[PDB]
């Protein structure tokens, strides 16, 4: 009855939320348990905390091809959320899935900028498609913790107190999404017959905002005007890949420059998800 | 009387995060030290702000800014620190601040392990607390169950071994294994208990005083399988590196159990309503 899901990378930022979202959806949830690399107290405790919620642990190693095959044979769907070298370990996962033969869908570690735009992620896609593994690519949003809570400033995760850099004129549309919402959309789409072999864009409508609109949401919550320093494009390219990431998002507008139909956008596919709006998101910092 | 306001220092540490939640559970108005970011540290930031949803307040302060420590402690009645273990010695700056503010009714320094006065920068911190005249409680005497029980006291891992296990000496030295949650709850109960002002509190839940070989047997009965044991002489063990030695005092010298403690200084008796987790329940999560 339940879809059986294996979550790969279950102790990461996105992966842990995907574990929880799969359980909250009612999926029978399995989490890949990799051989310890270190005395890692919070890693181990996070993993075992999942059992208390009803998840099961499956031990396997990426260096052990047969242990991966044994793992994926126990589930119906695989979701990966590796850090993004670590993206490429999914190639081992693809061969294991291809050998196993029983996987109905694979969602690789995407959850960001679409890599098919004119990349290790694209190499994983090709292997998936070469093997004929049904897939769903979840893309198109900035994690609110990495880009909204710091008003998109680099090198920090919390609002600045007095000053703020604005990229260009800060009128390039961006997509700011609470990581919990991304995970819940992921749990809902992964067995949806409508999203088989599709790209799903996480673009909740009211969270499509320019940097300046984000800052102005904050300024209205606090009642304080920030001192703004506009940084021109070339002023931003003083760098001789993470500056590259910001440049594509805030200068090239790579998240919002192509329109998406309702049949491929998460908030339209799953309108019951009451996604967190950025004014609510930012309240925790007041 | 009223809440009793507590500032937790090291609030995103292993022990500190449990202490934050314990203080909220006990009904204290709970404040957490927000230190300036040293890096893009997503899980550290999310942990800190998760406390707000639970009713805690954050106070930004820096150890390198004496005036920010003063201001932070001036907003609370009690201070509890749980720094990793230099980390220890930064508490000296905190004592100077506590000294100047002059409103702190009690300070619990970062202890929660072997009593150093029976073996240290912890002792240095004690000396400063006492020289300054700051009322104190020292919480000592227990092995964290995550570091010593879930691995059956094996080094280099935190989960039960699959078939063989090392026995230190004869595995008949008494050790104290306690759930970190219980340590934190005892800490939140004791920090304003008049019976423990200016005392050492020993966390020694009676049913959790166990030999390594007893711990192993609890697990063998849970799994129904016996484990291949190999014993290891003190001298062998000591064949030449501070983690080792922590273990040696604990499992060879028996430093946690070689002295008696009285009920008016033992947490499980001071706080008998804390139904502490026994090791047979603790280990079940691993099955
Ligand atoms: N704004 C946005 O849209 C963002 C996009 N992303 C993307 O989301 C996806 C997940 O990112 P994130 O949550 O930050 O990932 P994490 O950095 O949190 O790592 C997650 C897990 O990946 C496993 N892992 C990492 N390296 C290796 C390795 N060499 N070998 C084996 N396993 C490894 C580990 O799994 P285990 O739990 O088993 O130990 C680790 O816990 C990525 O594709 C990333 O590009 C992430 C940041 C922001
Ligand atoms: N078996 C046992 O009984 C055990 C005993 N202990 C003892 O418990 C106490 C706390 O240990 P534990 O919870 O594991 O420690 P942690 O390593 O988990 O504590 C980390 C926190 O302490 C702060 N910290 C660390 N270094 C610094 C620094 N240079 N400057 C400022 N802050 C710093 C940070 O505070 P912030 O959150 O604000 O960023 C950090 O988050 C210690 O006294 C330890 O000796 C701990 C392990 C096992
Ligand atoms: C907030 O300050 C920073 C934030 C980051 C976040 C990095 C941002 O680019 C992020 C990212 C990676 C992959 C993506 O597909 C992605 O899509 C938005 C974003 C990185 C996530 O770790 C990097 C450097 C910083 O200084
Ligand atoms: C579980 O494997 C290890 C576990 C540790 C735990 C270290 C154990 O000695 C612990 C300790 C530190 C301070 C203490 O006061 C203490 O009292 C028991 C124990 C250390 C806590 O970080 C160290 C090395 C290991 O290989």
Pull the structure tokens for residue B173: 């030295």
Q: Whose CA is nearest to atom 16 of ligand 2?
A: B84
Pocket of ligand 3 contains residue A112 by CB under 6 Å: yes
Which residue from B154, B9, B137, B129 is spatially nearest to B68, judged by alpha carbons?
A: B9
Q: Are B31 and B5 in contact (CB under 8 A)?
A: yes
Choose the catalytic residue: A121, A163, A220, A228: A121
Nearest-CA residue of chain A relative to B286? A48
Task: Return d(Cα A165, Cα A151) in angstroms, integer.
Answer: 9
Residues 152-171 of A with CB under 8 A from B: 155-158
DSSP string of B63-94?
Answer: TT-HHHHHHHHTT-SEEEE-----TTTTHHHH
Is B248 part of the contact surface with chain A (CB cutoff 8 Å)? no
Q: Are A106 and A97 in contact (CB under 8 A)?
A: yes
Q: Are B80 and B93 in contact (CB under 8 A)?
A: no
For the CA of A31, the nearest atom of ligand 1 = 38
Assign A88 to helix, strand or coil: coil
CB contact under 8 A, B158 and A13: no
| Partner-chain residue, chosen from A36, A155, A284, that has the shortest CB–CB distance to B157 | A36
Contacts of A180 in chain B (CB under 8 A): none
What does each C-alpha distance from A285 to A211, A218, A221, B39, B58 come to in angstroms?
A: 18, 10, 10, 18, 10
Q: Whose CA is nearest to atom 24 of ligand 2?
A: B83
Q: Are B31 and B6 in contact (CB under 8 A)?
A: yes
Residues 131-150 of B with CB under 8 A from A: 146-147, 150
Q: Whose CA is nearest to atom 26 of ligand 2?
A: B87
- At B103, give phi and psi (nearest 5°): -110, -5
Task: Return d(Cα A285, Cα B53) in angstroms, integer.
Answer: 11
Assign B280 to helix, strand or coil: helix
3-state secondary structure A6-55: EEECCCCHHHHHHHHHHHHHCCEEEEEECCCCCCCHHHHHHHHHHHHCCC
Pairing of strands B143-144, B57-60: unpaired
Strand order across the beta sheet in which B78-81 lies = B57-60, B29-34, B5-9, B78-81, B106-108
Strand order across the beta sheet in which A173-177 lies = A142-143, A173-177, A208-210
Cα A16 to the center of its chain, rounded Å = 11
Could you report how far apart the first and last alpha carbons of chain B are, in Å? Answer: 45
Task: Return d(Cα A283, Cα A137) in angstroms, integer.
Answer: 31
Which residue from A105, A98, A109 is spatially nearest to A78, judged by alpha carbons?
A: A105
CB contact under 8 A, A157 and B14: no
Which residue from A48, A40, A38, A43 is spatially nearest to A13, judged by alpha carbons?
A: A43
Choose the catalytic residue: B3, B122, B164, B275: B122
* Angle value at C-alpha A107, between A102 and A110, nearest 5 degrees: 160
Annotated resolution, angstroms:
2.2
- B/e letters for A91-102, b = 16+ CB within 10 Å, e = fewer, are bebbebbbebee
Task: Return d(Cα B130, Cα A214) in angstroms, integer.
Answer: 50
Q: Whose CA is nearest to atom 14 of ligand 4?
A: B113
Span from the CA of B83 to the centroid of ligand 1 (angstroms) = 28
Task: Return d(Cα A110, Cα A132) in angstroms, integer.
Answer: 18
Task: Return d(Cα B106, Cα B196) in angstroms, integer.
Answer: 10
**B121: part of which helix (H) or strand (E)?**
helix B121-132
Which residue from A168, A188, A177, A173 is spatially nearest to A237, judged by alpha carbons?
A: A168
Q: Which of B10, B22, B30, B248 to mutate to test the pocket of ligand 2 (most atoms within 8 A of CB)?
A: B10
CB contact under 8 A, B14 and A158: no
Pocket of ligand 4 contains residue B147 by CB under 6 Å: yes
């Amino acid at each position: 009855e339940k879809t059986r899901v294996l979550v790969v990378g279950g102790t990461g930022t996105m992966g842990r939320r995907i574990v929880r979202a799969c359980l909250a959806e009612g999926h029978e949830t399995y989490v890949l348990q990799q051989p310890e690399t270190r005395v890692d107290i919070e890693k181990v405790q996070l993993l075992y905390s999942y059992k208390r919620l009803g998840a099961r642990l499956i031990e396997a190693s990426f260096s052990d091809h047969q242990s991966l095959v044994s793992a994926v044979k126990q589930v119906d769907i695989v979701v990966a959320a590796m850090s993004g070298h670590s993206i490429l370990v999914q190639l081992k996962l693809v061969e294991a899935i291809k050998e196993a033969g029983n996987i109905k869908r694979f969602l690789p570690s995407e959850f960001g900028m679409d890599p098919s735009r004119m990349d290790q992620k694209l190499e994983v896609r090709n292997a998936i498609e070469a093997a004929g593994i049904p897939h769903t690519y979840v893309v198109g949003a900035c994690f609110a913790a990495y880009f909204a809570g710091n008003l998109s400033q680099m090198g920090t995760l919390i609002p600045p107190k007095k000053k703020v850099n604005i990229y260009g004129d800060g009128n390039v549309k961006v997509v700011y999404v609470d990581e919990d919402d991304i995970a819940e959309y992921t749990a809902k789409t992964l067995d949806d017959p409508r999203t088989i072999n599709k790209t799903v864009y996480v673009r909740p409508t009211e969270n499509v905002l320019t940097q300046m609109e984000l800052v102005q949401i904050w300024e209205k919550l606090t009642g304080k005007e920030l001192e703004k320093t506009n940084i021109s494009a070339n002023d931003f390219l003083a760098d001789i890949a993470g500056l590259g990431h910001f440049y594509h998002i805030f200068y090239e507008g790579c998240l919002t420059d192509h329109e998406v139909g309702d049949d491929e956008e998460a908030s339209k596919l799953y309108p019951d998800v009451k996604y967190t709006r950025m004014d609510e998101y930012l309240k925790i910092f007041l």
